[PDB]
Amino acid sequence: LSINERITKELAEVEERERIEKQLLLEAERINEIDTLAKAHLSNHFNKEVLLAKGYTLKDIMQAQRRELVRKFVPIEQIKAIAKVSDISHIDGEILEQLVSLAKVNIKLRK
Amino acid sequence: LSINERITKELAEVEERERIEKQLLLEAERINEIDTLAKAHLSNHFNKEVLLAKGYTLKDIMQAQRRELVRKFVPIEQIKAIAKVSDISHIDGEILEQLVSLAKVNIKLRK
Amino acid sequence: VEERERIEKQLLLEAERINEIDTLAKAHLSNHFNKEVLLAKGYTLKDIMQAQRRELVRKFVPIEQIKAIAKVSDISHIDGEILEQLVSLAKVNIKLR
Amino acid sequence: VEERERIEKQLLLEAERINEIDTLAKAHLSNHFNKEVLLAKGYTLKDIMQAQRRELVRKFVPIEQIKAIAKVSDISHIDGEILEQLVSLAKVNIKLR
Q1: What's the burial of C50, exposed, middle or buried (CB within 10 Å: 0-12/13-18/19+)?
Q2: Which superkingdom, per the lineage (chains A, B) (predicted)?
Q3: Exposed, middle or buried by CB within 10 Å (0-12, 13-18, 19+), for B38?
């Protein structure tokens, strides 16, 4: 193959590694945000240490903290406007992200 | 074989060697120009050191530098006009020489 | 007769090209290079068209591109595919103008 | 025709080598050994290149390397693979310089 094939391959590999690095930074920021939210707005019983002792995955801890934050801040008048039902006992993901963004807005306006 | 045949054969041989010498000097100037262009207008990522280490022909290195310079300087409309196509990955040659001449004109007017 | 039909197709193509060149040249260059006055001065149709094309190049395409892409500063004898490239570059220049 | 293609490839290779030698020699040795003035003095291209290589050796490669590696103090008649070794050592010397 001519060198232009690597003129795109060499750049593609570097860009892929850069995107992976950016993803790692994003995950680190997400962990930091979850830690800050759990420390500031949620009880000590929902700490990562005690949850891990009870034996829950890190992603499970993050989604549980997010769910508790949503129930605490976002009222049902928005939970049933986004998730369309009040409780989110088994619900997490994109609606959970929208709801935690709404909860961040809620705490910002509460302060 | 007469004396005049000897003269014309000797003169033809001498002129052929002189033309080969001029071709060597022309390729010399081409390599020098590509080195200067790569150092001045393109990133160190596309250096002859790494590109030679990648097991690619020097002519391929030259044309890769030329294509990158054309994309950097020559506008896409000018590429689509002169080269009749947007993609430059298969336009190495005399059309590429015209494109890099246009790129040299572009950088001269840019300065 | 389809040979003559295709000949007429090519005739239409070159006539449309000539018409477009004349229409843009009248509004861009001058009235001195009008087809009627050039014919009165005694130039064939192809000579008129190539002269108008060269004037279009001299108006839009810059001299550096003339002496680099076309390899000669004088467009007086460069006619051909190089002239086609020059008029294409002139079209790009007037488009961006 | 691929035989002539490979001949042209070798021509390109030696031309690039001549390029590199001349460019470094101009900035390292002197302007007196420029290709134009040497040609005016009447030296063939290969003679010019080998003389420039020998001057590069005499500038970078020290005399002890000359008299032991090349087995002779004088680089006047050592040309060949030994001259290639000497110029590679000279390139190493200028790299470390």
Answers
A1: middle
A2: Bacteria
A3: buried
What residues of A are in contact with residue B64 (Cβ under 8 Å)? 3-4, 7
How many Cα neighbours within 13 Å face the side chain of B26? 8
Task: Give the Cα separation of A14 and D14 in Å (integer).
Answer: 35
Kindly state the tokens that stand for A42. Answer: 């949620």
CB contact under 8 A, D15 and B25: yes
Alpha-carbon distance A94 to A67, whole Å?
12
Name the token pair of B32: 């020098």
D and C: touch, per 3+ CB pairs < 8 A? no
H-helix or E-strand containing B64? helix B58-73
Taking the CA of residue C22 and the nearest CA in chain B, the distance in Å comes to 21
Q: What is the DSSP letter of B90?
A: T
Instruction: Select from B96, B97, B101 the residue whose CB has the most chain C CBs within 10 Å, as the one to mutate to test that interface.
Output: B101
Return the DSSP state at D32: T
Residues before each break in chain A (C–N > 2.5 Å)? none
C64 and B108 Cβ atoms separated by less than 8 Å:
yes
Angle, helix A3-41 to helix B58-73, in steps of 10 degrees: 60
Residues 6+ apart with CB under 8 A from B21: D45
- Smallest CA–CA distance from A1 into chain B, residue: B56
* Cα–Cα nearest to C35, from C21, C54, C17: C21
Helix segments in chain A, DSSP class H: 3-41, 48-54, 58-73, 76-82, 94-110
Experimental method: cryo-EM
Query: What is the spatial distance between Cα B54 and Cα B48, in angstroms, rounded to a whole number?
Result: 10
CB contact under 8 A, B60 and A10: no
Q: A73 Cβ partners below 8 Å, 6+ apart?
A: A41, A102, A103, A106, A107, A110
Residue of B nearest to C86 (CA): B82
* Residue B43 Cα distances to B69, B103, D25, angstroms: 11, 16, 27
Q: Which single residue is written with the structure tokens 């900035």?
A: D27
Give the distance from residue D59's alpha carbon to the nearest chain B alpha carbon, in angstroms.
Answer: 23
**Which of D20, D23, D45 is closest, CB to CB, to B21?**
D45
Q: How far apart are CA C49 and CA B78, in angstroms?
A: 24
Chains B and C touch (3+ CB pairs under 8 A): yes
Structure-token pair, residue D97: 């310089």
